[PDB]
Amino acid sequence: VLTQPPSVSGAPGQRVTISCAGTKSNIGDCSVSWYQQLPGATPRLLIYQNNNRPSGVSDRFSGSKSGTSASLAITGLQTEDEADYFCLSYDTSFSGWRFGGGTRLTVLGQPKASPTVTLFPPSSEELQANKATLVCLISDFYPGVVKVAWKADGSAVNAGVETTTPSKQSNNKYAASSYLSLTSDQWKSHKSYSCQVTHEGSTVEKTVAPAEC
């Protein structure tokens, strides 16, 4: 019921705004507060009662509210502002506090980078346990959002897929994994299996086959 865009971008030095769309029942009538959370870190209060800054919070951050929406503004954008930003408001219809979904702020700089994709077939050892895990490893992409699709022979594979959230590498690009979990019998009933990775409207795919050679 509090709606934030999932993602916002800005260039170093620029002004960005993050909005939280609500209704009369929350933002319209109640105090909005804003929280910043660096990756892996703890949330931190930035703004309370719509537009107040606690001490020790930079004057680059400011908050306002108009009608049923509220906005956090950030001037002189710096790389260390890369974080997830949340709004919070009581909601008198809900009779409870509601957080926005969070807006992840990206500070533009590093050029686009397409993923490296590595696909492994089940090992012989695992197949002897009547199991077969296909392992698709995805690395070196930027920005850090990918979509993974699996294919068996020609068709789409939905059952048995599990994919990690993208994580940061030491070289400032991103990584993810996806696992297709099968039985040995499943594995051997198709002649090809594919892992397809989509990054910025571009697709990279790998293919394995139970007939190794």
Binding site: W97, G102, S167
Partner: protein, 227 residues
Amino acid sequence: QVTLKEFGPALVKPTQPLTLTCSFSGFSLRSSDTAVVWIRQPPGKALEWLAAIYWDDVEHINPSLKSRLSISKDSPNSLVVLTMANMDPVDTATYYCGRVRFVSGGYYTDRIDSWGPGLLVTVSSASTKGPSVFPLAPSTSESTAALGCLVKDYFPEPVTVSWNSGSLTSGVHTFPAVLQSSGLYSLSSVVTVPSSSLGTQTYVCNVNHKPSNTKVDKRVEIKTCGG
């Protein structure tokens, strides 16, 4: 000046109750502008308000979770307890406790101005279990080849992986683990090496799982096919 710390189990089993304890410093829960709140965040998801307990023992509990939660305080010892009933795997999350302050007499002005570092609670039926370790091999006409080791179905975190007893660091990428719906983890470690020396070099993944007292070494052999 203000600090809080969460205490409690790192793991809990489905249908069991979770009880967390918040210890705080640099303020008094007797102050008439003060409350202590419990917040949670599933990995990669949004913050969610659980329960807050106020200086005069007013409580504000998430109406969606009301039937499962309770909260209480011991102001003289700076402790606040949260209990949550009938745990579910979707409840795996980082649990934070925080200070709430607000304007006395005001209308829901409350803000969370101070935060503990948060405790990651994993809900899983799993007992401690050492990984099964499988070799991952490839297709070898390009200059390098990726070999790896599937570290499968272990609990709990963490696991460490080296290659050739630490003698090989270049080109090693160990990927973050996935928590499966089974309540067990799996990860993969890969090393990218020259294709030219696949028959000249031996590659062994060393996998350690301290909770289960497990140490596994696994040689990773290229699958060769007739010319």
